[PDB]
From a paper:
We made crystallographic analysis of T315Q. The space group of the crystal was C2. The structure was refined at 1.90 Å resolution. The whole structure of T315Q exhibited no difference compared to WT13 with rmsd of 0.65 Å for 353 Cα atoms. WT had three Ca2+ ions, but T315Q had one Ca2+ ion. In T315Q, the side chain of Q315 protrudes inside, resulting in that the distance of Nε2 from the position where the Ca2+ ion located in WT was 1.8 Å. This suggested that such unfavorable distance (1.8 Å) leaded to the steric hindrance between the Nε2 of Q315 and the Ca2+ ion, resulting in the lack of the Ca2+ ion in T315Q. In conclusion, the alkaliphilic XynR variant T315Q lacked the Ca2+ ion near position 315 by keeping the interaction with three of four ligating residues with the Ca2+ ion. Our results suggested that T315Q, and presumably T315H, T315N, and T315S, obtained higher alkaliphily by decreasing stability accompanied by the loss of this Ca2+ ion and the resulting loop (residues 311–331) deviation.
Numbering used by the authors: 1 to 353
The structure:
């Protein structure tokens, strides 16, 4: 017999009901058919893969695009699901209008110090109003806010995005302050990043959050994107990362979990699914077994575990595979395959501890 479909097997969220919520990143067109069936049965938390990015919501000043985001919000509400917000501030694909001064010129080019100070206040003003408008619309349904995303540099220190070039660290402080102001004391505010398991980047995130917390900035938790691989990162470095942020009184959430079949870069990717050798899917299952064993071990310190997709037929790792294999290649990062059939990894995370 073939592996059963995802809608034919025991629920993931139910299995982790006493541990932490189980979430999925979705697009609005996934809220129908088999994917909607899978979400209802297996997940109790949602995040928008793309519909609530800054570029999606306010592509130009005062021009709001709520409809895709509102769908996702309604779906969460009417199925009693938690809802993460991705994301309030992010260097990736930020609408260019944010960093254009009053005359139409680029703030990053400005050389006069007094004018650079004016541009900083203008940008912080635009950021505050973006946050205030979105938080005021969605605070009733959002249960975790990714306030800023990917502000640490892989090379060490802070990422020198336009946000940092123009405002220093002030965009981060003002972002959390504004989300707290309009979200209320009950809003849960997160800083999200990837490779939080790499000790040097972990330590830079820790020292940023520690300094900001000492200055009264309201940060409730750390989001660990957890874009991981079969062989990397180690269970030990993941454990050490969660422990370090818990020691500051912060919550931990796994926010964008997916496990590539390949290393970094994903060279040698398979071209079709049926070419993936069984041994490799089983290596993925063994890795997921260990990872979710660690999550349950640390469950008191993790509120939510979200996968960056539902099933292997829609995910961003395919594009990365093609990038490094001359425009051909697929990946298979989830516990439900491209046909929605359970994978070995599903069986290794549904079973009892
Ligand atoms: Ca297991």
């Amino acid at each position: 017999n073939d592996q059963p479909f995802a809608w034919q097997v025991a629920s993931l969220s139910e299995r982790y009901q006493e541990q932490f919520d189980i979430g999925a990143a979705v697009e609005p067109y996934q809220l129908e058919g088999r994917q909607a069936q899978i979400l209802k049965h297996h997940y109790n938390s949602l995040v928008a893969e793309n519909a609530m990015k800054p570029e999606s919501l306010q592509p130009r000043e005062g021009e709001w695009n709520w409809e895709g985001a509102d769908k996702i919000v309604e779906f969460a509400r009417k199925h009693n699901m938690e809802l993460r917000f991705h994301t309030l501030v992010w260097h990736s694909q930020v609408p260019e209008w944010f960093f254009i001064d009053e005359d139409g010129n680029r703030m990053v080019d400005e050389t006069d110090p007094d004018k650079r100070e004016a541009n900083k206040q203008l940008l912080l003003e635009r950021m505050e109003n973006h946050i205030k408008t979105v938080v005021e619309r969605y605070k009733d349904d959002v249960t975790s806010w990714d306030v800023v995303n990917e502000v640490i540099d892989d090379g060490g220190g802070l990422r020198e995005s336009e946000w940092y070039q123009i405002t220093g660290t002030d965009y981060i402080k003002v972002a959390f302050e504004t989300a707290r102001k309009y979200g209320g004391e009950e809003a849960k505010l997160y800083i999200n990043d990837y490779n939080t398991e790499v000790p040097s980047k972990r330590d830079d995130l820790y020292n940023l959050v520690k300094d900001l917390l000492e200055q009264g900035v309201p940060i409730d938790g750390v989001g660990h994107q957890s874009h991981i691989q079969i062989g990397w990162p180690s269970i030990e470095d993941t454990r050490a990362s969660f422990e370090k942020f818990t020691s500051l009184g912060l919550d931990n959430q796994v926010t964008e979990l997916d496990m590539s079949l390949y290393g970094w870069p994903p060279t040698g990717a398979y071209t079709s699914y049926d070419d993936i050798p069984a041994e490799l899917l089983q290596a993925q299952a063994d890795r997921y077994d260990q990872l979710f064993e660690l999550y349950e071990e640390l469950a008191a310190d993790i509120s939510s575990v979200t996968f960056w997709g539902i099933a292997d037929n829609h995910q961003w790792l395919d594009g990365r595979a093609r990038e490094y294999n001359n425009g051909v290649g697929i990946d298979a990062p989830f516990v439900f395959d491209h046909n929605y059939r359970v994978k070995p990894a599903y069986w290794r995370i549904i079973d009892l501890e």
